[PDB]
Design a protein around this nucleic acid. Structure first.
Length: 1301
RNA sequence: GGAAAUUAGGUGCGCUUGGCGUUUUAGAGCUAGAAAUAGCAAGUUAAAAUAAGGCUAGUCCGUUAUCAACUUGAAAAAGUGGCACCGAGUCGGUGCU
DNA sequence: GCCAAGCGCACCTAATTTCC
């Protein structure tokens, strides 16, 4: 018999069904294993596998990094404590000890409870003189008096432990603090360079503008606005932006050919500036210096106002005191009835909650704001609140802007002050400072000893790596090299050959000749088009591609064919407007080394290939020098300086051994040789690789030498969908064994599209960058119309006119490619215009009329990067011919056939495992075909009822899939791999996919092309309806061992209960608090004896123990010792059953339960509603007129509202066993019986949350809501029937646990 | 179906790094009462931990993927369950071997 | 439990040119 298999792949489900020629679902008796009275059972060959989602590795990685950083932060302190160890023991012997015990309660604390000095008197005095750490810091920076070494350590430790960011490479100058004096100095040096066009900085408040709390882009706009006739994209405008921390491009300001982007924070700025000044002149040298100095002043004034930061923290502390003192007074005098709630009540978001409650600054401001407004004399207070500078703490969320240089400055100062009084401080100055400054390079990674699967570093020595001897022990080279070599692709054609750099000389030679060998030309003398020749190819490369970075068709026509070969009229094919491939690297090195004869000499191909490789591999200037030491004799000093800066990025798709190369046997030529000259053939790369006349094909296939899991894991795509793919393959494989190892006829796959789950800042940056290129709040950009308004510079996209910023609601949002052809609603296919009719045709790409008029305006937006390249091409698609009638057909075809790559991988895998010439055909459809089939023939789907619809979708897929391929034999739907046979009527093709493909279903007996019965409207319709009416479907919930975090991450306060988890072994929760809610990995059946106190006797028990994630490693190593440690003796090891989550149990009257944990159960049954009630619920919930009115009649005619309630009731009273809940359901039901059917049926659907398989959840009926009732007892399970299910659920082993007492 | 180039967007994997949060303790609360309770004073900071912990002791590892049961394999993983027919409230019945 | 910065590599999507 010939059977077919349908598949519905989701992120949490795999639907599957087996189907015969009559479109029916087979039945089979399956063997039942175990110790039960059941030996066989009848099951339909249809079902669904449900599972929890696959997770990404992101959360695991973030925590992995955080673990390393906590370890390394602690080490930094230890490094500092080591240096202080000797001299501290003389001053205080237990100081360091009191620090590492500070967390302990006074009882547990071995030493005296005062960490700093060890007595109450000195300790109180300290906090009295130094309320904050910044008071001490600022003190030690300025004062020249000998200070306590303990106070010196804590000041330095505080700097080390919280050292600030590393976003700014290099030092900053403390002297540059005056924003105005440096601004004027910046303007003056500008006017010195440009007397013809001076800048008046008379009435500009630079400090108020540049140090404003607004964005860099906003502050840039503010300052330029005060300057008449000055542009933001202007030279001075770009100088300000550089000073603000932005990255401007001076390429336009100096009419340069290449980019000249500068950023002061970047480590390569000094070289990029020297690169720029080399071209524009050293007359702008002290101009960028003046801009540099200004940025030093802007940076300081923003985050602070000899120890600027600490002093700024002190001022904040002082003003906090002032404003608090005033705040209490105004309350005592005006609102005394609110004083208790504000300053004593932690529960409220007042000052009390702000200090001791845990309320945030934002929550505190919102609460105290109306209070301030009600009172008077709060004018100076509310202005601070709106400026977010009212009653601020020192340690807050915005301290992240503080560079490490500033903490370093204070640290450096303190060490200098006490360098004389304390000896070892003078020697460890560079040493202590290094602890603060040292940052492990990203290209080095973890400093492992070969025990880390993430590490790649290689050491020079066996010594312990420290911040001081890092370069001595660590080989930066082999570490940085390995960093890139471990990620770079290998050639697919030559699996053992590493791929070439993207900017390789040979590579660009390849790309150019590959394109060049396929262009054609027609002159007046020839009647037929011809390929270029070897001599012609060599000339063009010599004269065009080596004399210009890019080559246009016009350049090919004029500069070559007309100028060199004396041809007036020439027409070029195989290339449009300009060549895609180019020789960029060649022109780069040409400008650098200034030796053309050296470059054109193929004798130095290996040399230049080695240079580009090292420039692509390494970024560090010091690493470049060591890798270019062999070429010191070839280039002068100035040449090497320009070559070290030239660093490339990116890697190609082909290896060197492949391109030039393996030689063909007879010809002796490499692939590149063929691309240079191939007589009349001019075969391109794809033709050479597949040519059986050549030996490239054989050499490649002989070069190619993996588990299914690993292959799937390596595929791109979400781990959620990849998980479903693996289970799909297992379902199919088991189904084959079910069908006696016989392959199916067809496999029809339907894969659901996944869901769409900082953005305003991303959108705001693309606007600011676009406006500045045109010379024209963040949360507001959420709206599509407003966002497009700025994207279109307040102008129409179809008409040359300005749009009103108010009547946005009165204007239209249009789609470039009509919604009928493509299902795209993104901004890449969206346009804000005044009218729909201004686009021209309503069934096509915007007319050539509006294209010819708006082409320029669009290009301006394109060059301003306000619109995508793709969006541009779609806007002007009518210029190239517009949407063809075949294109219209293609868009309809691609609505039925899946296009996604990840789906093609599933089809490819199943095609490789089934066909071993082609026995099985793999078909991949979209959900549209089945969905329309359900809507057309009233096979309505209601997901909230049960999970059967997953199996239904799979069933309907195989039906529609195999019937369409039988009725109309075409293979644009069936998957083919590597066996592609390269080889009007579109009006019919468009009409074909538009209707006729589903029409042969509509109505009597449809036949195939050669007398083959395909669809019988008399019987096959009832067959499908019968299938969807089957009460038995194999629904399997994939049982899984829970992994991940030990518990919830929230550390709870101390409590008297013993439910809390200890954060450390010695930290009892009663005194220190801890975690709650431990996560259970899996449960274990335990049949043993337990001591029944206090008789010291034994009583045999049968219990369910939950093995938590934390305990799992301990348990699995030695379970019997583990169980004995918890009070379980006389343990029957043979009765230890592993019970992961979702383990299935059957009880009385067929009710099933699944394990959610060792103490909670879930509902294990499905409510199989008849199809009649299903269609009624769909229609009544959704409320051609001649066709829609008739369906409204049956809706009105039927009284099913009372019958569905009876269905749920019978199910609930039998299986759900929720007495109190169900009674509230029935009472609230008839309560709203007066409400219309649409309002009734829509709430009836909500009621199925009561009967849904899985975890109990709350559901509401109108205004009446119902709390969820979960099963908090697992005692029932112990005397029930455990059911081990295979992935399909067809093969099951059931264990009667009642015989294990 | 697949490959290369050109433009761009987007997603992931890995590394390096900053700032919060949380938890315990330190920062002597005072006065009036026999005490529960009132009147006030005060609050901004720090230490330490930040999965338990582990060994190979590294400035390393510690939350992804994968997992029914029963037989096998170092492993990857591979093996193990008779077929039609008639019905349908979760699968049942009848018949063949 | 959250927010933020930087670097590299790989992949997918989406139109053009040339091919298998």
């Amino acid at each position: 018999k010939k059977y077919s298999i349908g598949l519905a792949i989701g992120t949490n489900s795999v639907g599957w069904a087996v189907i015969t020629d009559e479109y029916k679902v087979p039945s089979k008796k399956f063997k039942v294993l175990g110790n039960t009275d059941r030996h066989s059972i009848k099951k339909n060959l249809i079902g669904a596998l449900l599972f929890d989602s696959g997770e990404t590795a992101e959360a695991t990685r973030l925590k992995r990094t955080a673990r390393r950083r906590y370890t390394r932060r602690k080490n930094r302190i230890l490094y500092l404590q080591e240096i202080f160890s000797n001299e501290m023991a003389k001053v205080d012997d237990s100081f360091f000890h009191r620090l590492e015990e500070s967390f302990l309660v006074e009882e547990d604390k071995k030493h005296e409870r005062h960490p700093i000095f060890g007595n109450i008197v000195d300790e109180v005095a300290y906090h009295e003189k130094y309320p904050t750490i910044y008071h001490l810091r600022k003190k030690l920076v300025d004062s020249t008096d000998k200070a306590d070494l303990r106070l010196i350590y804590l000041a330095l430790a505080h700097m080390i432990k919280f050292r600030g960011h590393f976003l700014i490479e290099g030092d900053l100058n403390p002297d540059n603090s005056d924003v105005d004096k440096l601004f004027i100095q910046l303007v003056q040096t500008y006017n010195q360079l440009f007397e013809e066009n001076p800048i008046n900085a008379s009435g500009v408040d630079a400090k108020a503008i540049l140090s404003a709390r607004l964005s860099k882009s906003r502050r840039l706009e503010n300052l330029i606005a005060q300057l008449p006739g000055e542009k933001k994209n202007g030279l001075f405008g770009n100088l300000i932006a550089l000073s603000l921390g932005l990255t401007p491009n001076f390429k336009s300001n100096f009419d340069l050919a290449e980019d000249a982007k500068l950023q002061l924070s970047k480590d390569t700025y000094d070289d990029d500036l020297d690169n720029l000044l080399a071209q524009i002149g050293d007359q702008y040298a002290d101009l960028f210096l003046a801009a540099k100095n200004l940025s030093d002043a802007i940076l300081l004034s923003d985050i602070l106002r000899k120890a600027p930061l600490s002093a700024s923290m002190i001022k904040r502390y002082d003003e906090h005191h002032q404003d608090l003192t005033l705040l209490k007074a105004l309350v005592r005098q005006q609102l005394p009835e609110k004083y208790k709630e504000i300053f004593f009540d932690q529960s409220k978001n007042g000052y009390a909650g702000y200090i001791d409650g845990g309320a945030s600054q934002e929550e505190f401001y919102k609460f105290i704001k109306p209070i301030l407004e009600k009172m008077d004399g709060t004018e100076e207070l509310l202005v601070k609140l709106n400026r977010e500078d009212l009653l601020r703490k020192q340690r807050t969320f915005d301290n992240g802007s503080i560079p490490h240089q500033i903490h370093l400055g204070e640290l450096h100062a303190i060490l200098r002050r006490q360098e004389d009084f304390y000896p070892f401080l003078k020697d460890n100055r560079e040493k202590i400072e290094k602890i603060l400054t040292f940052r492990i390079p990203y290209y080095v990674g973890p400093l492992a000893r070969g025990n880390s699967r993430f590490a790649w570093m290689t050491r020079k020595s066996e010594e312990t790596i420290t911040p001081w001897n890092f370069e001595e022990v660590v080989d930066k080279g082999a570490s940085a090299q390995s960093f890139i070599e471990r990620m770079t692709n290998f050639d697919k054609n030559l699996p053992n050959e590493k791929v070439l750099p993207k900017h390789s000389l040979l590579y660009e030679y390849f790309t150019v000749y590959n394109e060049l060998t396929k262009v054609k030309y027609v002159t007046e003398g020839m009647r037929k088009p011809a390929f270029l020749s070897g001599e012609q190819k060599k000339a063009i490369v010599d004269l065009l591609f080596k004399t210009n970075r890019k080559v246009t068709v016009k350049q090919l026509k004029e500069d070559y064919f007309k100028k060199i070969e004396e041809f007036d009229s020439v027409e070029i094919s195989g290339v449009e407007d300009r060549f895609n491939a180019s020789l960029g690297t060649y022109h780069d090195l040409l400008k650098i080394i200034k030796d053309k004869d050296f470059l054109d000499n193929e004798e130095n191909e290996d040399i230049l290939e080695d240079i580009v490789l090292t420039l692509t591999l390494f970024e560090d200037r010091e690493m470049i020098e060591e890798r270019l030491k062999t070429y010191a004799h070839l280039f002068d000093d100035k040449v090497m300086k320009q070559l070290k800066r030239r660093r490339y990025t990116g890697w190609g798709r082909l290896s060197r051994k492949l391109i030039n190369g393996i030689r063909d046997k007879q010809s002796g030529k490499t692939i590149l040789d063929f691309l240079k000259s191939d007589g009349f053939a001019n075969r391109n790369f794809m033709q050479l690789i597949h040519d059986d006349s050549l030996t490239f094909k054989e050499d490649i296939q002989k070069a190619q030498v993996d588990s299914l899991h690993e292959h799937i894991a390596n595929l791109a795509g979400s781990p959620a969908i990849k998980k479903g793919i693996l289970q799909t393959v297992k379902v199919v494989d088991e189904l084959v064994k079910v069908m006696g190892r016989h392959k199916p006829e067809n496999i029809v796959i339907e894969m659901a599209r996944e869901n769409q789950t900082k953005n305003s800042r991303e959108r705001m940056k693309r606007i600011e960058e676009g406006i500045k290129e045109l010379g024209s709040e963040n949360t507001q950009l959420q709206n599509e119309k407003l966002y497009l308004y700025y994207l279109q510079n307040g102008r129409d996209m179809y008409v040359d006119q300005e749009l009103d910023i108010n009547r946005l609601s009165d204007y239209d949002v249009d789609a470039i490619v009509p919604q009928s052809f493509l299902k795209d609603d993104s901004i890449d296919n969206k346009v804000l215009t005044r009218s729909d009719k201004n686009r021209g045709k309503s069934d096509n790409v915007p007319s050539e009329e509006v294209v010819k008029k708006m082409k320029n305006y669009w290009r301006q937006l394109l060059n301003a990067k306000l619109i995508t390249q793709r969006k541009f091409d779609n806007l002007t698609k009518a210029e190239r011919g517009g949407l063809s009638e075949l294109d219209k057909a293609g868009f309809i075809k691609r609505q039925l056939v899946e296009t996604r790559q990840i789906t093609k991988h599933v089809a490819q895998i199943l095609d490789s495992r089934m066909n071993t010439i082609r026995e099985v055909k793999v078909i991949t459809l979209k959900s549209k075909l089945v969905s329309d089939f359900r809507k057309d023939f009233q096979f309505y789907k209601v997901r909230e009822i049960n999970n059967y619809h997953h199996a239904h979708d799979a069933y309907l897929n195989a039906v529609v899939g195999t019937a369409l391929i039988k009725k109309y034999p075409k293979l644009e739907s069936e998957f083919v791999y590597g066996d592609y046979k390269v080889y009007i009527g579109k009006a019919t093709a468009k009409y074909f996919f538009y209707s006729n493909i589903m029409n042969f279903f509509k109505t009597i007996e449809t036949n195939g092309e050669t007398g083959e019965i395909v669809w019988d409207k008399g019987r096959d319709f009832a067959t499908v309806r019968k299938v969807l009416s089957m009460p038995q479907v194999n629904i399997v919930k994939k049982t899984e061992v829970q992994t991940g975090g030990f518990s919830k991450e929230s550390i709870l306060p101390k409590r008297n209960s013993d439910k809390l988890i200890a954060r450390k072994k010695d930290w009892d929760p009663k005194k220190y608090g801890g975690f709650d809610s431990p996560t259970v990995a899996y449960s274990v059946l335990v049949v043993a004896k337990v001591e029944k106190g206090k008789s010291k006797k034994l009583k045999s028990v049968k219990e369910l123990l939950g093995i938590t994630i934390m305990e799992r490693s301990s348990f699995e190593k030695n379970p019997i010792d583990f169980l004995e440690a918890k009070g379980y003796k006389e343990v029957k090891k043979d009765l230890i059953i592993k019970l992961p989550k979702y383990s299935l149990f059957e009880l009385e009257n067929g009710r099933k339960r699944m394990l959610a944990s060792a103490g909670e159960l879930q509902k294990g049954n499905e409510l199989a509603l008849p199809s009649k009630y299903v269609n009624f619920l769909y229609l009544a919930s959704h409320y051609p007129e001649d066709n829609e009115q008739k369906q409204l009649f049956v809706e009105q005619h039927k009284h099913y509202l009372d019958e569905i309630i009876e269905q749920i009731s019978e199910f609930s009273k039998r299986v759900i066993l929720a007495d109190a809940n169900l009674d509230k359901v029935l009472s609230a039901y008839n309560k709203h019986r007066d409400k219309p059917i649409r309002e009734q049926a829509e709430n009836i659907i909500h009621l199925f949350t009561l009967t849904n398989l899985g975890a109990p959840a709350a559901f509401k009926y109108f205004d009446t809501t119902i709390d969820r009732k979960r099963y908090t007892s697992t005692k029932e399970v112990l005397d029930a029937t455990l059911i081990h299910q295979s992935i399909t659920g067809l093969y099951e082993t059931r264990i009667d646990l009642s015989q294990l007492g």
